[PDB]
Symmetry: C2
Subunit: 479 residues, 2 copies
């Protein structure tokens, strides 16, 4: 393959496209014998050179990595998420779909097809592996064989066009809670709220509209509510016609937080929109209710965090204003005005990729993990694992050293009934000087002493998005 | 896996154990559209940590790499050679066989089993892939699927215990010509000569004895003769009982060159042994006849080339005396004495891994390729590809640069009837600074301008031994 000599395809961003199997990877330390399950994660990884001769990182085909941990050892299985895009281009031996979220650049032979790369999350639910991309229904796969099933449209009961890559699981019911924005077509202001039973059946789909079309990448879920931030990374057909990146950031637009009842009978009039001054937030650590208030914790930045989705008025990217810090947004459903109740920074540590013990989804919670960027460390990057204790305020930091960087952590509970945070953190470490990757295993509430096990991969993973642990019994692997 | 922190298992020698598939590898330059076939090579690569807690490179399990070149692109498929050793240890989840060529260190549960790692050659013949190790019958595999068949004992017609890893193909008949030393048991002085028909049937096996048991790793073949150098890298049960490496080098023993008729009715009395002063040679570029003389070209060194098979009188390893140079050994079957007719250095370039256009096996020939060690180059190693022209004396050199090293080249003929050397060279390049490997493609008689195509692998291969090209129609791949 002749790939472009551009930053998105060279160095750490060289295409990999490895499908492989390796049991019993070389490792150091002690892998807890308690661990019996697998960590799934996804990397964008282009099957083919881009039609245009350049592209962005968020547009690579989804490649799924599975780390099966059992019997004190770690195995790897890596396979493509075989989206319709993947299959069609594989059959043709060439790229057919074009630029990011831009159907005007597709070959005529794939007009109307799902454009999903399934490259944003590798999520386990209802016995399936979900390879997810927010512009289409989710792909599903067999978590044991990692063969691909296809797109999940829930027996035709789903009528929206799209499905999130940030599903939540409500610990009260076991339901998956999801959204799908641009639900009636590209750049539309329609959004669907979905709930899926533990057995994988669509319970309900509820339609509503948002103040403006924008990237609705993540969201919060509480017992009663969908908690949906409206942040002006906006797109339009006009932008696509002019050859601009689909999304650009508009610093002049307000930010909203919508509180949307989790009800099949939802009507537009039931929704409250709170309004604040322009800022940027993408991910949600957790949301929860307190009396008539709703709290949601997000990494907040002063300005755009996506340089490839540039300022719509032509401003150059500002890295300092892109530094995000975990911040609590609080709104009161009983308040008279549309103002937030408060906006409270929770740490001065800069970071992203927030995570919790997902058994606390929608509930008051004590622990949050993040990828931290400590700019005071030597670099010879997201260079630390960070743990915040909301009860005491205490913070822990683990630095990966001066030639490495880190990927998103994922929490592994010790048992169904264990206390919050009782378990382990796993995360990929980019050993940049060695052009390889490690999988790190930490004791989840004692990270400053470093990982208790380091699993070496004999090759490099690419930049990853989201990932999740599932116990073996949930994914068809051995007891 | 917990592997030792010793040189044989760290750095460039870290275990890899990657089984993978990647079509359409990232590449630069132009892959000749004429190419339609595959290059097979083997790396020792330990499935399990060694029982003793250390080991040598030559004892790693064989991992087979296939580079399928077609339609201007290059694909990789990599799979284990599933020897009985591999299967038994895989079933047990642990190492069962011990030190190199030392059955005294094996677990009692595998006494008497073939100890082969199939780690020295990946050879194509009679529609099969041969994964070869000189202490056992060859393993065979499907060259298209790279599944393993098992050990080849030719329907019981082979009674020797062992089969070489340096088979030759006689261009006159298409027969595979092979030896097997220690043919009646470890450290015995019996050797078998084998010829195999193009259809894979054993034609004959002929037994003889050698002046002393030693590592008979390679050999030459001419129309009339097996050409067998006797070089005193010797082994013994006594050495094994004392915990020494199987082989050690004895500088006080003579070197012999045996000329053995290629005849099923061979008797010991038919053999001529020529004798010379102590030296070291392992590999054979080619051998051929001229009148009543026999010529064989070998990389000759003054002393031992294997530091892990040390001097038997305790001398420290001497790297300068290990530097080998292509040298022609000439004997005359009509000579009265046992002296060589001549010993003639053919180049002052130091090198190993000699190769030819294998259509010239056993014939007078013009071209020879080698891996060269140019110690005058900056190193920031086997660092050059070398081509010798025996007709004009001319030499070509291509340097891989100051952070790389090279593996064995292999010649690809343009067509069955093309002139000698008309075709391409392929070889793996170790990009040590990048911790990855490339496959290089050269125009075989024009190497100084560098490769015409560079195929990037997104991971590192380990040190390799021998490899071979086969056209697609010989290995069940597409026309
Ligand atoms: C990996 O692809 C995407 C990632 C994100 C946020 O991290 C937003 C949109 C994408 O398409
Ligand atoms: C890769 O294993 C071997 C290699 C050699 C010579 O290169 C001799 C004996 C072996 O077992
Ligand atoms: Co219903
Ligand atoms: Co995300
Ligand atoms: Co016969
Ligand atoms: Co050899
Ligand atoms: Mg269904
Ligand atoms: Mg501002
Ligand atoms: Mg047979
Ligand atoms: Mg001498």
């Amino acid at each position: 393959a002749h790939f472009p000599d551009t930053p998105a395809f060279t160095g750490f961003n060289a295409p990999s496209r490895i499908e492989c199997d390796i049991p019993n990877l070389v490792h150091e330390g002690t892998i807890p014998p308690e661990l019996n399950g697998a960590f799934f994660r996804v990397q964008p990884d282009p099957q083919f050179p881009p039609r245009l001769g350049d592209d962005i990182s968020f547009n690579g085909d989804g490649m799924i990595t599975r780390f099966h941990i059992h019997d004190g050892q770690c195995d790897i299985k890596q396979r493509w998420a075989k989206t319709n895009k993947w299959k069609l281009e594989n059959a043709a031996g060439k790229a057919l779909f074009g630029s990011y979220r831009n159907p005007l650049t597709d070959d005529e032979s794939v007009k109307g097809e799902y454009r999903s790369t399934a490259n944003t999350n590798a999520f386990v639910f209802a016995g399936k592996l979900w390879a997810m991309k927010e512009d289409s229904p989710s792909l599903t796969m067999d978590p044991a064989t990692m063969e691909t099933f296809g797109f999940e449209k829930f027996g035709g009961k789903m009528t929206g066009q799209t499905f999130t890559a940030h599903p939540k699981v409500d610990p009260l019911t076991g339901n998956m809670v999801a959204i799908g924005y641009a639900a009636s077509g590209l750049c539309t202001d329609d959004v669907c709220l979905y709930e899926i039973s533990p057995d994988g059946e669509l319970i309900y789909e509820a339609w509503f509209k948002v103040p403006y079309y924008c990237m609705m990448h993540d969201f919060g879920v509480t017992k009663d509510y969908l908690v949906l931030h409206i942040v002006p990374s906006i797109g339009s057909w006009d932008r696509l016609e002019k050859g601009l990146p689909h999304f650009g950031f508009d610093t002049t637009l307000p930010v909203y937080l919508g509180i949307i009842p989790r009800r099949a009978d939802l009507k537009q009039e039931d929704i409250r929109w709170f309004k604040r001054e322009n800022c940027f937030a993408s991910h949600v650590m957790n949301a929860f209710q307190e009396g008539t208030k709703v709290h949601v914790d997000v990494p907040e930045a002063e300005n755009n965090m996506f340089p490839f989705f540039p300022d719509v008025h032509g401003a150059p990217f500002n890295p300092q204003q892109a530094m995000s810090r975990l911040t609590r947004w609080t709104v009161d459903m009983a308040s008279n005005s549309d103002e937030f109740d408060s906006v409270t920074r929770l740490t001065e540590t800069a970071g992203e990729f927030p995570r919790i013990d997902d058994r606390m989804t929608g509930l008051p919670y004590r622990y949050g993990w993040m990828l931290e960027m400590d700019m005071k460390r030597p670099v010879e990057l997201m260079n630390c694992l960070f743990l915040k204790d909301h009860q005491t305020g205490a913070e822990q930091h683990w630095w990966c050293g001066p030639t490495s960087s880190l990927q998103e952590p994922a929490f592994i509970p010790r048992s169904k009934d264990a206390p919050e945070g009782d378990g382990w953190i796993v995360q990929v470490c980019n050993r940049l000087a060695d052009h390889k990757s490690d999988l790190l295993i930490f004791e989840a509430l004692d990270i400053e002493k470093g990982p208790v096990a380091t699993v070496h991969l004999p090759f490099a993973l690419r930049f990853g998005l989201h990932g999740n642990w599932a116990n073996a019994e949930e994914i068809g692997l051995a007891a």
